Amino acid sequence: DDVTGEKVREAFEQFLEDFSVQSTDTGEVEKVYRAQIEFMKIYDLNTIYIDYQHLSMRENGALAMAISEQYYRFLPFLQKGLRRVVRKYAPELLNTSTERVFQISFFNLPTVHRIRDIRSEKIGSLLSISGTVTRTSEVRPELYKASFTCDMCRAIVDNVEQSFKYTEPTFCPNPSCENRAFWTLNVTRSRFLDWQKVRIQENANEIPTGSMPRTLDVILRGDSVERAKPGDRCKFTGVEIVVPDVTQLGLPGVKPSSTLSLGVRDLTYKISFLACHVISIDQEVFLNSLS
Amino acid sequence: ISSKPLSVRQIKGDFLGQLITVRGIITRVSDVKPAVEVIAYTCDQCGYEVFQEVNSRTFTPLSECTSEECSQNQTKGQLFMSTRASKFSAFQECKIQELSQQVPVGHIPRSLNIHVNGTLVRSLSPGDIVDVTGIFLPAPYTGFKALKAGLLTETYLEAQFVRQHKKKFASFSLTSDVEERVMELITSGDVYNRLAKSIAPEIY
Amino acid sequence: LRIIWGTNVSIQECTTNFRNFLMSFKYKFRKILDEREEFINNTTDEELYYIKQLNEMRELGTSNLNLDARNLLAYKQTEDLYHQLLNYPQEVISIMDQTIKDCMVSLIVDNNLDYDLDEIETKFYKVRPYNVGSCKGMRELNPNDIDKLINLKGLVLRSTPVIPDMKVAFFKCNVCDHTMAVEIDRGVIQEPARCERIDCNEPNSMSLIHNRCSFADKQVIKLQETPDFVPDGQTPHSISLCVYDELVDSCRAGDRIEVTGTFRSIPIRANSRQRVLKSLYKTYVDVVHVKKVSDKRLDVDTSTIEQELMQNKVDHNEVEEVRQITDQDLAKIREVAAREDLYSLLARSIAPSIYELEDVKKGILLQLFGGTNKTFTKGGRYRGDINILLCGDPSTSKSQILQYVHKITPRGVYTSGKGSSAVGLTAYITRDVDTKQLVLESGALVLSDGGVCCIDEFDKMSDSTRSVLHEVMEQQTISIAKAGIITTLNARSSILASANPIGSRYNPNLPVTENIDLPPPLLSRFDLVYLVLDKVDEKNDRELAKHLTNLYLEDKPEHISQDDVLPVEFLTMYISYAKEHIHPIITEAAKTELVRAYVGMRKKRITATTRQLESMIRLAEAHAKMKLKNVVELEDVQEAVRLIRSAIKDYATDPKTGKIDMNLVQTG
Amino acid sequence: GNGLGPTRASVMSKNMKSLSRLMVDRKLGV
Amino acid sequence: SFDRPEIYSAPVLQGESPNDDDNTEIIKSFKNFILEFRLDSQFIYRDQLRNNILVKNYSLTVNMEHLIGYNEDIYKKLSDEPSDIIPLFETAITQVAKRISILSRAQSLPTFQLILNSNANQIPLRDLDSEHVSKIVRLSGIIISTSVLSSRATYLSIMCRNCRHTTSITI
Amino acid sequence: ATTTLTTRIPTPAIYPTEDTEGNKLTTEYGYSTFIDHQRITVQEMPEMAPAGQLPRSIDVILDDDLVDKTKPGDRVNVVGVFKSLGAGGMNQSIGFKTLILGN
Ligand SMILES: Nc1ncnc2c1ncn2[C@@H]1O[C@H](COP(=O)(O)OP(=O)(O)O)[C@@H](O)[C@H]1O
Ligand code: BEF
Ligand SMILES: [Mg+2]
Ligand SMILES: [Zn+2]
Ligand SMILES: [Zn+2]
Ligand SMILES: [Zn+2]
């Protein structure tokens, strides 16, 4: 294992408990993260909103910089730390009632990147984008964790994690088997989340001289599905992501390729986005959202 | 035989491999692109350079070292293309058609591919009356398998010599050959009237 | 000793020569090679060019040095290095980069500067050559010219999005978590056959993590060449530039650039059967340096690029967006602005060979200067783009003026009547055959954003095509809601349209509006309408004939314009600088005069319009901006009103019926 | 020869390392 | 209607250094041992191979302990895994034989066979263990039964019966 | 199968690249024999075809001296064997390829 990952995970779960923002005159000081955890237990939701400003304030923002620069690498550590914190205080909401997935969303990033500002050096990092929603697809299931039926000693392995791509369980329900050639998936022991792809488009005011509009594909995973109608300006916060592309086969420039036998595979990709959450920009509900 | 130019219609299957002269009008010349002849690789481990000859429209790249010493050695070797080391030939395709006079009664003209290699590129332009001399080589068929019944082959003419039927103005050069005749014209005088009357003398 | 294989380059000798050139280069050498020794300066020529440049490189902190290859030709000791640089791009460029780093650190050390060497040795310096010989086009590049420096100039048609390019793979061992990082070398990644650890050995433990790899920018730019020479019957050719790293997102559609780089060739895979390559190689160009600015054309308008430059400075793209004006040049510009005949001088400087088109040239000058680009705090903006229509008898040199404007402006497209089409201007969806994907592409109006769009044979255009001009000529934007795209596009283009009256010649019997024969909503949008008239005047005809016949006195003669003119380089510099650093504001007296004049005009012949009021506003602002004044005065409005009245020949038209008094309108 | 030499940097670029492998004798040509 | 494309090769630059275990280096050492072994100031093996070529006997009789002096490491490799190194020394003999034959032609050869005569210790037949498997051993005893000569193929030309595709595998 | 009427035993067409002894072979164009081959499609004559119904067509394989004896749109009377070719899907991968060999 990695020592640095353990360090960042333990610090994460440490300040999920030790952090406490003041309430100024009215309310003294309260544990904002613990207050949000109590809110989570009360409403039985599935996603926790964490302000980036507080993380920047804490510990001279070194941990904030570390989590912003390498969000993808530390994400499983973040999930584990949050699970342990939930176990410490109010562990009732841990399970679905098999297991309930906890989503972590960061909001109020210091800066906003336009679609034309996407850069390769920001790949895998945390940032925010602002675009206009053009096409929205159906909310479809995706394999959070995948179960399969064995080939030799036909039997079903239960609740195995499914990565970004198809995975094969190395272990077997029968330990003597150690055969994985033919797996038959079963939906019962396979977890799922909500998947929806939204094609955002650059806003008019951000377009340079002469350039025709540029657009990006944004994937909304979790409760944020169907949160934006087509033709609305929304602010997306998430992690910069890459997805394989097979169309750029004749483009100029040497195509990266992997050799392994032969083991050939063209490493061509296109940039996309995975957004943690989306923010847009009777008389009772209307009357409520006023000062 | 090469003395007598032939129309595209008369270029039968009997003439393959020969050196023939096709007289026609150039229709559609593509632009010069590099056609690889001998792709060159480098094995960094064994410090060799391995060459793969190519004589087909399509080729398969190499990945494992072919160096004899590196072949006997069981140590893994990887090759890389070296475009600067590889051999290229300037390539062009011209697709000459038939002159209107050559088409028999009731038919339409039909075209014939021309392959241009080396320093002959850029010598043929659309709308040129030329007598291209070349080797009438065949090529493996790339059409439908249903139409292919046997070892069907598509043909072409590897260009060797190009004789423009009408000299371009931009290619003029004041050598003795043109100098003597130009002197003959001017010394006789009356160049304006002679050149005016010489345009369509049948018109009165 | 020790020349590299396949090359004529020796590392030690080339580094020695490059250091020698860096140490002892003076611009007087380039002046000698330019045969411009009569222009030798005592100050700049004496000073060491590249040593100073490396200095300001050190203080500023940039990492890229732009080298002029003709400077290498100037230095005798490095004449061979010039040819070595052309023939061997990558090796010699790497040599230059290493030498630049060496020279930087050596210069810090020798002077014992307090500046720390921590940053310097860690940084990576790049050399970007340019001015590498001629162009030669692309039809003339034989396959023997693969991997050589070439110089290309053309128009940027389309620019693809940013394409990530893998630099380091991140294969992860499933079993023992042996996460090895594999750098890419010569565009090849080698997979570990088994686990690279000795204790753990599992070939299937490898599963590449796409997301944790480190990528680099790559942008493909479609450039349509405009070579200085064109062979007979050769349609324009499109070549695919491939920029990298900081140059990404620098060149916008419609920019007329000159690019230098490495002429490459890459096999293209016949996707019918995988891992089978076609024997014909696709040709593209890697890009090392881009030169957008030129002294023969106006610089790009900073107002239209105000939004991106602040972020581009952080992006470290470091391209010459704007030309740097020397203090001596600024003083010269101010001195010229102090001249008494500034307006007439600048008028006759544009299109110098055109004789006796005085009002036309003045209006063209005012359009080139443009009006103030107002901005509203609430929202919206009023742009000072002046739209000019030319109408009159044939052979009045309208097309020549159109070509002059099309040459001078930074961005512009010259279209002609029936050639243009409504989807052709605005935008269209096209299938890029390289990616075999429907790719969005812009049209002539959007291409001409921030510049003057020249339209010839305006009358011949169908009114159907003309409809899209209605929104562009007023709102400076085009809102397209065709299939697949629903948005608004900014087209800050000032139209310069030339047309003929109906019957291809002016008819004094018909009224002015009948002779022009355009819908009133269109003609209302035009700020200036010129009735260029061809009338048989013996003095004028004699002068014009003398001018032309004198133009036919040498093979490539000089202008017969008796009056002196500003050379086009300084004229472009002056117009540009006045555009960036002057922003006139109307004064109250100008406001009163404008109101009075508007009421005077607004009292059949062409009718007055509120667009005419905004037209006087823009023209007075432009006239003030020419004079470098920061405010608008009464004389500016008077001149604008004079121009509007004279262009339509109002001094010779009967009020009730718009018949031009032919005897009265006569002018030399 | 002289006894003095220009100051040189310490870090060599990776491209320099790649170039240094392809080195052959100078008697080939000039 | 095209000829098969050739694949050339050529050494251009000095790559990574040839390791001692490299087969080419083994062959070079063997060739030098054949060409430079001196006994009584006589090139015993070179002259023996020359005579063997002359008498058309394509084989070489190399004394085993003569090899330990020239290269103890290669002798250890031979006595450790003979089934891998012995073809290499046969190849070296073949190359030297080709050179000698071509040189002496002034007034093709099959793969030569190596015959190893040794004087080292002889393992008793009962003393053979599991360790000696695939290791050169010296044995002594009495020959009781010699079988009939059985012909084995060393180079045979094959042809696909349907494809009419000639090929030549070497054993 | 086309060039002969009776079904011959199928011998795959392998181009000889090497000699029987492994020597390289250089193909000799200009000594090898090539035969002209052309396929034409004959459709029902419009004069005799029923009106308002789709036409029916047959494929004719011409060879050697019979090539290029017709122009598209001609009216022809082609006579030849109505041969059927191919396994016609009977061999595991909707009828048989049927064509009129040209006499
Ligand atoms: N006043 C003029 N000054 C300079 N050149 C002129 C003038 N009038 C006509 N010409 C010349 O006559 C020709 C007419 O110009 P052109 O733009 O083609 O005509 P049009 O106005 O019909 O488009 C050009 O070669 C131009 O140089
Ligand atoms: F005869 Be011109 F082009 F107006
Ligand atoms: Mg005109
Ligand atoms: Zn099992
Ligand atoms: Zn090798
Ligand atoms: Zn491992």
PDB file of N, CA and C in Angstrom, chain C residues 292-322:
ATOM      1  N   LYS C 292       1.555  35.959 -36.536  1.00  0.00           N
ATOM      2  CA  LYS C 292       0.290  36.559 -36.946  1.00  0.00           C
ATOM      3  C   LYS C 292       0.462  38.003 -37.394  1.00  0.00           C
ATOM      4  N   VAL C 293       1.309  38.764 -36.712  1.00  0.00           N
ATOM      5  CA  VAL C 293       1.430  40.193 -36.977  1.00  0.00           C
ATOM      6  C   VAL C 293       2.337  40.420 -38.177  1.00  0.00           C
ATOM      7  N   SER C 294       1.994  41.419 -38.982  1.00  0.00           N
ATOM      8  CA  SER C 294       2.811  41.822 -40.113  1.00  0.00           C
ATOM      9  C   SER C 294       2.723  43.331 -40.263  1.00  0.00           C
ATOM     10  N   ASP C 295       3.812  43.930 -40.741  1.00  0.00           N
ATOM     11  CA  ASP C 295       3.856  45.376 -40.895  1.00  0.00           C
ATOM     12  C   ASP C 295       3.165  45.858 -42.162  1.00  0.00           C
ATOM     13  N   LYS C 296       2.769  44.952 -43.053  1.00  0.00           N
ATOM     14  CA  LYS C 296       2.034  45.329 -44.251  1.00  0.00           C
ATOM     15  C   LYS C 296       0.529  45.367 -44.037  1.00  0.00           C
ATOM     16  N   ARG C 297       0.046  44.897 -42.891  1.00  0.00           N
ATOM     17  CA  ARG C 297      -1.373  44.876 -42.583  1.00  0.00           C
ATOM     18  C   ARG C 297      -1.594  45.426 -41.182  1.00  0.00           C
ATOM     19  N   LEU C 298      -2.822  45.864 -40.929  1.00  0.00           N
ATOM     20  CA  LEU C 298      -3.174  46.355 -39.606  1.00  0.00           C
ATOM     21  C   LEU C 298      -3.069  45.233 -38.582  1.00  0.00           C
ATOM     22  N   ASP C 299      -2.732  45.605 -37.354  1.00  0.00           N
ATOM     23  CA  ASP C 299      -2.686  44.629 -36.281  1.00  0.00           C
ATOM     24  C   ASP C 299      -4.099  44.249 -35.854  1.00  0.00           C
ATOM     25  N   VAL C 300      -4.208  43.086 -35.208  1.00  0.00           N
ATOM     26  CA  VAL C 300      -5.503  42.624 -34.734  1.00  0.00           C
ATOM     27  C   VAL C 300      -6.041  43.589 -33.686  1.00  0.00           C
ATOM     28  N   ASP C 301      -7.348  43.828 -33.729  1.00  0.00           N
ATOM     29  CA  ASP C 301      -7.968  44.766 -32.805  1.00  0.00           C
ATOM     30  C   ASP C 301      -7.937  44.209 -31.387  1.00  0.00           C
ATOM     31  N   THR C 302      -7.394  44.996 -30.455  1.00  0.00           N
ATOM     32  CA  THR C 302      -7.296  44.533 -29.076  1.00  0.00           C
ATOM     33  C   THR C 302      -8.652  44.520 -28.389  1.00  0.00           C
ATOM     34  N   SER C 303      -9.566  45.400 -28.802  1.00  0.00           N
ATOM     35  CA  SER C 303     -10.886  45.433 -28.182  1.00  0.00           C
ATOM     36  C   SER C 303     -11.616  44.110 -28.371  1.00  0.00           C
ATOM     37  N   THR C 304     -11.499  43.511 -29.556  1.00  0.00           N
ATOM     38  CA  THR C 304     -12.143  42.226 -29.796  1.00  0.00           C
ATOM     39  C   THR C 304     -11.401  41.086 -29.108  1.00  0.00           C
ATOM     40  N   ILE C 305     -10.143  41.299 -28.737  1.00  0.00           N
ATOM     41  CA  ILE C 305      -9.342  40.281 -28.073  1.00  0.00           C
ATOM     42  C   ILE C 305      -9.031  40.678 -26.628  1.00  0.00           C
ATOM     43  N   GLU C 306      -9.735  41.684 -26.102  1.00  0.00           N
ATOM     44  CA  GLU C 306      -9.516  42.111 -24.721  1.00  0.00           C
ATOM     45  C   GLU C 306      -9.811  40.989 -23.734  1.00  0.00           C
ATOM     46  N   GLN C 307     -10.743  40.098 -24.080  1.00  0.00           N
ATOM     47  CA  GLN C 307     -11.230  39.120 -23.114  1.00  0.00           C
ATOM     48  C   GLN C 307     -10.239  37.986 -22.881  1.00  0.00           C
ATOM     49  N   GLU C 308      -9.419  37.653 -23.877  1.00  0.00           N
ATOM     50  CA  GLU C 308      -8.617  36.438 -23.811  1.00  0.00           C
ATOM     51  C   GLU C 308      -7.165  36.680 -23.424  1.00  0.00           C
ATOM     52  N   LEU C 309      -6.647  37.894 -23.626  1.00  0.00           N
ATOM     53  CA  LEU C 309      -5.213  38.129 -23.476  1.00  0.00           C
ATOM     54  C   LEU C 309      -4.759  37.969 -22.029  1.00  0.00           C
ATOM     55  N   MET C 310      -5.588  38.394 -21.074  1.00  0.00           N
ATOM     56  CA  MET C 310      -5.209  38.301 -19.666  1.00  0.00           C
ATOM     57  C   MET C 310      -5.021  36.850 -19.238  1.00  0.00           C
ATOM     58  N   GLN C 311      -5.897  35.956 -19.702  1.00  0.00           N
ATOM     59  CA  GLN C 311      -5.736  34.534 -19.413  1.00  0.00           C
ATOM     60  C   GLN C 311      -4.621  33.907 -20.242  1.00  0.00           C
ATOM     61  N   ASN C 312      -4.417  34.387 -21.472  1.00  0.00           N
ATOM     62  CA  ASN C 312      -3.348  33.855 -22.308  1.00  0.00           C
ATOM     63  C   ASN C 312      -1.974  34.156 -21.724  1.00  0.00           C
ATOM     64  N   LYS C 313      -1.830  35.293 -21.040  1.00  0.00           N
ATOM     65  CA  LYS C 313      -0.566  35.591 -20.372  1.00  0.00           C
ATOM     66  C   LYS C 313      -0.241  34.533 -19.326  1.00  0.00           C
ATOM     67  N   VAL C 314      -1.253  34.071 -18.590  1.00  0.00           N
ATOM     68  CA  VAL C 314      -1.053  32.972 -17.651  1.00  0.00           C
ATOM     69  C   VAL C 314      -0.788  31.671 -18.400  1.00  0.00           C
ATOM     70  N   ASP C 315      -1.465  31.469 -19.533  1.00  0.00           N
ATOM     71  CA  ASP C 315      -1.322  30.225 -20.285  1.00  0.00           C
ATOM     72  C   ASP C 315       0.091  30.017 -20.817  1.00  0.00           C
ATOM     73  N   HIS C 316       0.919  31.062 -20.830  1.00  0.00           N
ATOM     74  CA  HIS C 316       2.305  30.987 -21.301  1.00  0.00           C
ATOM     75  C   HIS C 316       2.391  30.622 -22.780  1.00  0.00           C
ATOM     76  N   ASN C 317       1.372  30.992 -23.563  1.00  0.00           N
ATOM     77  CA  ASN C 317       1.427  30.742 -25.000  1.00  0.00           C
ATOM     78  C   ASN C 317       2.541  31.550 -25.655  1.00  0.00           C
ATOM     79  N   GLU C 318       2.681  32.817 -25.268  1.00  0.00           N
ATOM     80  CA  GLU C 318       3.779  33.684 -25.693  1.00  0.00           C
ATOM     81  C   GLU C 318       3.892  33.752 -27.216  1.00  0.00           C
ATOM     82  N   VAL C 319       2.835  34.267 -27.833  1.00  0.00           N
ATOM     83  CA  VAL C 319       2.832  34.577 -29.256  1.00  0.00           C
ATOM     84  C   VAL C 319       2.718  36.085 -29.408  1.00  0.00           C
ATOM     85  N   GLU C 320       3.206  36.592 -30.534  1.00  0.00           N
ATOM     86  CA  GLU C 320       3.172  38.028 -30.802  1.00  0.00           C
ATOM     87  C   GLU C 320       1.769  38.391 -31.270  1.00  0.00           C
ATOM     88  N   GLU C 321       0.883  38.658 -30.308  1.00  0.00           N
ATOM     89  CA  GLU C 321      -0.468  39.088 -30.652  1.00  0.00           C
ATOM     90  C   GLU C 321      -0.470  40.501 -31.221  1.00  0.00           C
ATOM     91  N   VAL C 322       0.318  41.398 -30.635  1.00  0.00           N
ATOM     92  CA  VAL C 322       0.360  42.798 -31.038  1.00  0.00           C
ATOM     93  C   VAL C 322       1.806  43.177 -31.322  1.00  0.00           C
TER      94      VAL C 322
END
